[PDB]
Structure 1
Amino acid sequence: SVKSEYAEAAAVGQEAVAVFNTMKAAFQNGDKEAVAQYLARLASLYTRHEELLNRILEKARREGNKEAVTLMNEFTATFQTGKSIFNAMVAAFKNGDDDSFESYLQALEKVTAKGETLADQIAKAL
């Protein structure tokens, strides 16, 4: 159902939290080869998460679930802000710019946490 797709989406978000925290530790420790790999893994997780979110939103639209559509539109907009910051972080890593990388890491943490405050409402509305 749209709910089992939402639980999978939630699990993928949690996988990203796990891999992100491991990546942050590796960045702090100077292990650039590990960071590179975690960044690739986070990019794949973003693509998969986005695909699950799009299927949930499309199914809520086809079901006429107006409140779920509203909440999913808001959440996906914030999700995309996160993804844009993530892309800038990857670019800073490629460019050898640790100052910007650290800043984007902190910013991405705050933007993703902001979007997660909509999760309980979405789960209830689906």
Structure 2
Amino acid sequence: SVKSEYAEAAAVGQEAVAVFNTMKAAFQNGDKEAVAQYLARLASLYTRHEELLNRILEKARREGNKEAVTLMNEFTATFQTGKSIFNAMVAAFKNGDDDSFESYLQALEKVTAKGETLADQIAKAL
């Protein structure tokens, strides 16, 4: 069902949270080789999460589930904010700009924390 597809998407999201926190520790410790690999892993995870979310939204639309569509439109918009910040973070790492990397990292954490009540609402709406 769409509900079980959202639970699968939620687990991919939690995987990115786990890898992100490990990446943050590596960055603080100066282990740039690890950071580079975690950033590659996160990019793939975010790509997979984004695709699952789009399929879920499209399915809610085909089902006529107006409330779930509203919430998923809001959630996918927030996802793109987080994705844009992530990409800026990757660029900061490439450029060796640790000040910008720190900035974007904290921003991504706050964008992600804010979006959590909506994430839970979607599970209940589908």
Bucket of the pairwise TM-score, normalised by the shorter protein:
over 0.9
**CA RMSD, 1 decimal:** 0.5
Any idea what the Cα deviations from partners look like across 1:69-101, whole Å, max 9, x if unmatched? 000000000000000000000000000000000
- Displacement over 4 Å in runs of 4+: none
For 1:84 and 1:5, the matched residues in 2 are separated by 25
- CA–CA distance in 1 between the matches of 2:10 and 2:103? 26
TM-score normalised by L of structure 1: 0.99
The worse-fitting range, judged by mean Cα deviation, of 107-116 and 55-64 is 107-116
Q: Distance in 2 between matches of 1:119 and 1:103?
A: 24
TM-score of the superposition, structure 2-length normalised?
A: 0.99
Taking every aligned residue pair, what percent have the same amino acid on both sides?
100
Give CA deviations for 1:36-65 in whole Å, capped at 9, x if unaligned: 000000000000000100000000000000
Question: What is the deviation of 1:106?
Answer: 0.2
Aligned length: 126
Shift of 1:114: 1.2
